[PDB]
Design a protein around this ligand. Structure first.
Ligand code: HEM
Ligand code: HEM
Ligand code: HEM
Ligand code: HEM
Lengths: 106, 106, 106, 106
């Protein structure tokens, strides 16, 4: 449940996908990432505890996970069609979104 | 005109967005990026020179511009509404799309 | 609460949007739709009752809500900016997502 | 080039996809649709000739094709992974977008 637990999962599985050598292994990893992203979406980070749940910052915070999940879902779709390398390249790119939210809210 | 020229407009303008003080500045920079992106769409990069107009590759390449185009269009909605900082955050996220395309194709 | 209840909120509110005279009306209706959509996300429809939590099906189903969520969020940006008619047009387009999910899963 | 030519192509190929019984035939059709949508995107419909090229109506007109192409690109991706029925269902759904733009601008 904890935001510091979803982030762990997110970081771990990224490593798993990088080392993967087949589609099934990538798919399995993308799925846990998807689930951790989904769960995180509903959280309040230490930096935004003082902000309106309805604030522009929390709509954006939640919107960053919306973007992530989307990109996880595209990566997953590549792995489901056997396209392993394309799906690992997509997972690699995920880090830019991770960073763009970390820069504003971590 | 050129692909290279399209890319310069894109890169110069992101900087103008980062440094902007007001909405009009960001709006003007996004409009020039929309026009560059649209123009770049029909280009063949030197690394896909030998591939068919209908290669998985050229379709993927065009699609990255489709994404950039939608992003810049959303940033623009923000700037037209005077939301300067959220437009600048949108530009930051936009970089990821730049980079993903450059990883595969530059 | 229920899936059925989530769907009613969704349907009632689209009507309020169509009939609205001003931005505040549309904004309020979109906020109630955002909340319904988020809640509906975790549900299992009676037609996917026998399928795994990780079936191509349940992933596809969740993804339709992901789309609706992003659409309603964009409509909301419009309404927060006072763009009443463009928000109402956004709601019209939004119906397609409703229908696509209902074709596969209702 | 003509807008009345892209619309024809768009309508014809839809019929082709409905009757298709295999992935290659669907893919071929989705590709011509993609090309006709791309070309249409740059046009001025009889109803908007008097509007600013920069108007909210023309940003939206162009934005309707952006949505279409996106959905064509997802349909295509299903066909490229052998998923024929899912890709024909996706092509069927395209009609709701066709209609939502026709309702405002045809
Ligand atoms: C694959 C994508 C991501 C990865 C691998 C990842 C990884 C991490 C890691 C390892 C930490 C803990 C670092 C520390 O203890 O100092 C962290 C924290 C954090 N992350 Fe992420 N992250 C990702 C995406 C995101 C996104 C999209 C958001 C926001 C929308 C986000 C928001 C945050 C915040 C606010 C913290 C600080 C946690 C705290 O103060 O308890 N992360 N992330
Ligand atoms: C706003 C985001 C973007 C920025 C800021 C950007 C920036 C640049 C710059 C400055 C260059 C050439 C100079 C150099 O070597 O650095 C370049 C080259 C290139 N870009 Fe981009 N770019 C962006 C988006 C894209 C996208 C979305 C695509 C494809 C969909 C793309 C494809 C390419 C290719 C293929 C080249 C090399 C072309 C050549 O060698 O002539 N870029 N980019
Ligand atoms: C704003 C758009 C939507 C509207 C207006 C809407 C409307 C409705 C209504 C009024 C019902 C139940 C009553 C009836 O039979 O008509 C319903 C049922 C249902 N909807 Fe939606 N809906 C929307 C979006 C969605 C989406 C996005 C999904 C999936 C991603 C979905 C999945 C379902 C399912 C599975 C049922 C049947 C549930 C049952 O039998 O208990 N709907 N919808
Ligand atoms: C698969 C999707 C689509 C199909 C099958 C389709 C089909 C058609 C057809 C058959 C016509 C001609 C009807 C007549 O002569 O009376 C037409 C016209 C038109 N379409 Fe579409 N359409 C699609 C999508 C769109 C979209 C997305 C837009 C706008 C963004 C659009 C804008 C228009 C307009 C403005 C006209 C009137 C043409 C004129 O006055 O010359 N269509 N379309």
């Amino acid at each position: 449940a904890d935001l510091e637990d979803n982030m762990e999962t997110l970081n771990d599985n990224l490593k798993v996908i990088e080392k993967a050598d087949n589609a099934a292994q990538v798919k399995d990893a993308l799925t846990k990432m998807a689930a951790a992203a989904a769960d995180a979406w509903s959280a309040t980070p230490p930096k935004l505890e003082d902000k309106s749940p309805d604030s522009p910052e929390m709509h954006d915070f939640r919107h960053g996970f919306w973007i992530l999940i989307g990109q996880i879902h595209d990566a997953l779709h590549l792995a489901n069609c056997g396209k392993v390398k394309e799906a690992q390249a997509a997972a690699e790119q995920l880090k830019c979104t991770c960073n763009a939210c970390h820069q504003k809210y971590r």
